[PDB]
Design a protein around this nucleic acid. Structure first.
Ligand SMILES: [Mg+2]
Ligand SMILES: [Mg+2]
Ligand code: NA
Length: 328
DNA sequence: CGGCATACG
DNA sequence: CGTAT
DNA sequence: GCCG
């Protein structure tokens, strides 16, 4: 009764197995810090299965037959059910390796590979990094300078104000262009780590060259604390007003032609695991290649036209899920 | 055993 | 290498 | 780590 792919089942934002899923996601995260992408995926998928269940798991036998639960994930749940704590998870939580890799990778501009190299070099704290700034990229310097603000959750109230200022710049850059809120906020989240916007124009081709024009206008308004600058994705740090002051917020802007908009909307609305699972399903079950630009039939050498996300779910033979049920 | 999503800056 | 869902 |  539980499908194996996350894109085959509704996953709401809030659910009935929060503690169990959080523990499995610690193990997934730790696996990623060690470069074990397969184990990360299994632990993520097992966590996501629990998010999709209609009620709390209370007994080990209720895991029988659930996809992605084998010996290891089942033992984690067993210990949580019997003792309220899983020793492996707590050992990860406490470990110097986990805590430092988490600290470093949550810096904008630092990935697993950089964090691991720093860790092996003996570095452990943000002030350790600040002491040797000549070794930092410009992006990393911005991520470290703004780290405290970027660690503060963005609220849904922040988003409306941001969208208005982005729309103002977009309308001067290209009248008629539109701004759509994507990412976690479109899936119903009340907070987030950043704000994701997708920009298009109803006349195919008019969006070409748009993002530089948008960025130059936002920068002229004094709103851009950091950006990387032809391009179509911008990973920015914005200045957001606050009472008597302001705070730094991560904002991502993406431009797509209207022909690709349903694919870009689907991709950028996520969740990350949902999209990985959807692309895996498309290729492995349907023989079609999915990305944020389109859906390709490699036998006919043709792209599927889509006018809506609904079209895309139909072309993959999947029941439609609204964004609020893509919280895999 | 192979496979694990797929892009752009 | 980083970034995005 | 788990699936097919
Ligand atoms: Mg986001
Ligand atoms: Mg983002
Ligand atoms: Na990072």
């Amino acid at each position: 009764w539980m499908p194996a792919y996350a894109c085959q089942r509704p996953t709401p934002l809030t659910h009935h197995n929060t503690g169990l899923s959080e523990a499995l996601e610690i193990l997934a995260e730790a696996a990623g810090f060690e470069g074990s992408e397969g184990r990360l995926l299994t632990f993520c998928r097992a966590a996501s299965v629990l998010k999709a269940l209609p009620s709390p798991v209370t007994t080990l036998s209720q895991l029988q037959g659930l996809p992605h639960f084998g010996e290891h994930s089942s033992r984690v749940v067993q210990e949580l059910l019997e003792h309220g704590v899983c020793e492996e998870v707590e050992r990860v939580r406490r470990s110097e390796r986990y805590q430092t890799m988490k600290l470093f990778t949550q810096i904008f501009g630092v990935g697993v590979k950089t964090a691991d190299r720093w860790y092996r070099e003996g570095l452990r704290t943000l002030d350790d990094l600040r002491e040797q700034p000549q070794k930092l990229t410009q992006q990393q310097k911005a991520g470290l300078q703004h780290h405290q603000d970027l660690s503060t959750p963005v609220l849904r109230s922040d988003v409306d104000a941001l969208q208005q200022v982005v729309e103002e710049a977009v309308g001067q850059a290209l009248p008629g262009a539109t701004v759509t809120l994507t990412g976690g906020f479109r899936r119903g989240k009340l907070q987030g780590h950043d704000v994701d916007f997708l920009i298009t124009h109803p006349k195919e081709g008019q969006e070409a060259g748009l993002l530089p024009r948008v960025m130059c206008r936002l920068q002229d308004q004094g709103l851009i604390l950091y950006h990387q600058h032809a391009f179509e994705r911008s990973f920015c740090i914005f200045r957001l007003p606050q009472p008597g002051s302001w705070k730094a917020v991560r904002v991502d802007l993406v431009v797509a032609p209207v022909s690709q908009f349903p694919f870009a909307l689907l991709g950028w609305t996520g969740s990350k695991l949902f999209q990985r699972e959807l692309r895996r399903f498309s290729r492995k079950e349907k023989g079609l290649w999915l990305n944020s630009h389109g859906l390709f039939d490699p036998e006919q050498k043709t792209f599927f036209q889509a006018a809506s996300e609904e079209d895309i779910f139909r072309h993959l033979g999947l029941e439609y899920l609204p964004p609020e049920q893509r919280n895999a």
